[PDB]
Amino acid sequence: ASNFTQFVLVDNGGTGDVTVAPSNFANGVAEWISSNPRSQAYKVTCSVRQSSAQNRKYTIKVEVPKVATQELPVAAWRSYLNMELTIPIFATNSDCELIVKAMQGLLKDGNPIPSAIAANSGIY
Amino acid sequence: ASNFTQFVLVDNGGTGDVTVAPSNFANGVAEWISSNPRSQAYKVTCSVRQSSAQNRKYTIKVEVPKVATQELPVAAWRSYLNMELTIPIFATNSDCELIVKAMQGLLKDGNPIPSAIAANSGIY
Amino acid sequence: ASNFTQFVLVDNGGTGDVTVAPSNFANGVAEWISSNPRSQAYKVTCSVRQSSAQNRKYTIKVEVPKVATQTVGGVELPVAAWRSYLNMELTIPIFATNSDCELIVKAMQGLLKDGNPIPSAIAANSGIY
Amino acid sequence: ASNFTQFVLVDNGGTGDVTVAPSNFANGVAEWISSNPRSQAYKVTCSVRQSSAQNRKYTIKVEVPKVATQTVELPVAAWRSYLNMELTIPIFATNSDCELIVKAMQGLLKDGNPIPSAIAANSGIY
Amino acid sequence: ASNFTQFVLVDNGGTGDVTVAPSNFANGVAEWISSNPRSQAYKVTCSVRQSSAQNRKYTIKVEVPKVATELPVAAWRSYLNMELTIPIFATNSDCELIVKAMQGLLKDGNPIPSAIAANSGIY
Amino acid sequence: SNFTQFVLVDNGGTGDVTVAPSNFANGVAEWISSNPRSQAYKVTCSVRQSSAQNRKYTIKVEVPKVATQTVGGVELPVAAWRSYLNMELTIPIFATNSDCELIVKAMQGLLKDGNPIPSAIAANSGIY
Question: Which residues on chain A are in Cβ contact (under 8 Å) with B3?
């Protein structure tokens, strides 16, 4: 019943895929990392908590490294995703499924926001 | 050249789809909303700015309403997504495309985090 | 594809209309100007923001110039002798449907329609009594 | 001979027109009301005063109610849209100058133009 | 129909021209950049506002990077800051004249662009 | 000396505005179209070490609206108003002459006819 499992973070077609695997759990925070050394690893974390009388709040983070040798194995830099999702306690399973779909549609290929990010440009 | 365009936020198969359309732009914040009344609308915003000498930072928000009549047309409640993505200025187009894919893989159907959200449960 | 477009501010029957054209956009404020020099231009601005949890608020401004020529030494500059300033604030609750908003627009139109008291009073620069 | 008269605020083509009628005058403020109960009424006010040595200032207000019944049933406005208009006219303005100012206000809000179209969609100009 | 469009910043004769394209707009500031990564990009910004009762002020910035033809970086950057004040009384012809003054200032063969291009002062 | 007269406003060989060297003091080179200064176009240029690694050019241009004002009851040459350009250019000390030539071309392309920014200025409008 444990949903703390390995998954594909970057799908490149079965070959060259970036998988992240469970590596730590502490204080409600589940952690995935792609591989050692951690300096060069993709990182994913997730936690959820009661943020108010009427809301649940997920905090989800992803770190995407630029992998370079500089001679330490290091990330030349990191892109950081910080995601917060608040869901009211009145939400049904269907409500939550709808919310997931909204998040997916937001970032689907060809849509404005992911297209802008992909070009490191703004919406105008 | 304006990327401020209407798109599908919730894909339900061509019928019953939730589309959001451009409705406002102010202070670097682009806004989409599905329809009037706004009290019941899906909402999407996006802005991006220089957060440090070396980073660009996107702030992306989505509001998913639970549409109910209570007699005001209202949202019984709202789920709020607050998304922050920091990208270093050294990032190429390919780097940014990779980051988008990481975000997509994070939320793909069947993966741990979207599955947990869909059940309003935690990772354990 | 944007609604930031030129329009007729003073309709004089299609001839010698006062048109205002898009000229600036900053901090959510759209600006139209009739022509250069700006000193003699009609100006229109529009902005809207969330003013409270339950209200959107439009701020609309119009400047009508009295167009003169400013002569001092024997130096002429194109100027407005003076300006009339309209400041319009409209709050619309987030519960408003398309029909609600259309109705609000009609109320504004009816307020200022020819022959009705308030525009008649303004046209005579007199009060309502 | 007084200009404080009833008029059509919302012209719907002779059926369900919203007329507002004189109902109050105090401290220079003329008020029109559509009907009782006031809780559900369209309301219009107008006043004008010398705002500076060289300017007069009109303050014109309109309230558009959303007419509901909130349930003990009260006749109420579920909400109200509030228009506040301030118009300053210099004392040098002729009759013609003032007629021009009115026309500018009218053209601003004419059907099909950007600003009334944006309001009608509860959207911004961008 | 918007004037926020891509243009040639450095004309090299159709071969290795430096083009800059719209990339951001916020708080009245239009931004162009040549390409990603931004670390190596040419950058252009433009904004304009009422600076006084009778004047409007354009603020124009250009960044020229030194970029080779390992982290992608600029070996260094040159910064242009331009401020132009135009009175509200200026006609179309007046504004066109002001632009021409700016163009003549920097035209090939003229003293100031010749001095800059030669890494020298005028004295 | 590179301190020479040039055409500031090219009107096509007809009523061109030239500015000629008129002053040098405290590192500032000055050109003016003609006397009296009340009606003159003016250009100044100076350069200095602004930091350990940068030289900084400070370039100013004044465009007058040229009128004639009559004062009891003589006609004075005046500017009805003035447009002011203040231009600052920072160049790192590592830049070669070729690098500097490239920077100049960038400034030229910035302001070339038909491009957005000079088009916006010419209409006294913004970029949007």
Answer: 112, 115-116, 121, 123-124
Q: Does domain E1-123 have CATH number 3.40.50.2300?
A: no
Are the beta carbons of A50 and A59 closer than 8 angstroms? no
Decide: helix, strand or coil at residue F91.
strand
Contact predicate A36/A23, CB 8 Å:
no
DSSP three-state, residue A81: strand
Phi, psi of E38 (to 5 degrees): -60, -25
CA-to-CA distance for D58 and D78, rounded, in angstroms? 29
Q: Does B23 contact D at CB distance below 8 Å?
A: yes
Q: Are B100 and B108 in contact (CB under 8 A)?
A: no
Residues of chain E contacting C69 with CB distance shorter than 8 Å: none
Q: How many CB atoms lie within 10 A of CB E108?
A: 11
Contact at CB, E22 and B1, closer than 8 angstroms: yes
Q: How far is B40 from chain D (nearest CA, A)?
A: 13
- Mapped onto helix, strand or coil, the DSSP state of residue F52 is coil
- Resolution value, angstrom units: 2.2
Q: Which uninterrupted H or E stretch holds B86?
A: strand B73-88
Type of residue at E1: A
Method: X-ray
If one looks up domain F1-128 in CATH, what number appears? 3.30.380.10
Distance CA A120, CA B86 (A): 10
Phi, psi of A35 (to 5 degrees): -170, 165
Centroid of chain to Cα E65: 13
Backbone angles phi, psi at D91, to 5 degrees: -65, -10
Distance, in Å, from the CA atom of A99 to the CA atom of A96, rounded to the nearest integer, reads 5
Residues in chain B within 8 Å Cβ distance of D126:
4, 22, 24-26
Are B9 and B31 a contacting pair, CB within 8 Å? Answer: no
Look at the domain B1-124 and name its fold. MS2 Viral Coat Protein (3.30.380)
The domain D1-126 is placed in CATH, from the list 1.10.1060.10, 3.60.15.10, 3.40.190.10, 3.30.380.10, at 3.30.380.10
Q: In what order do the strands lie in the sheet with E77-87?
A: E7-10, E18-26, E29-33, E43-50, E55-65, E77-87, F74-92, F54-71, F42-49, F28-32, F17-25, F6-9
Given the DSSP bridges, would you call strands D18-26 and D7-10 parallel, antiparallel or unpaired? antiparallel
Token pair of C88 as six digits:
């319009």
Whether C78 has its CB under 8 Å from any CB of chain F: the answer is: no
What is the spatial order of strands in the sheet that D74-90 belongs to? C7-10, C18-26, C29-33, C43-52, C55-71, C76-93, D74-90, D55-70, D43-50, D29-33, D18-26, D7-10
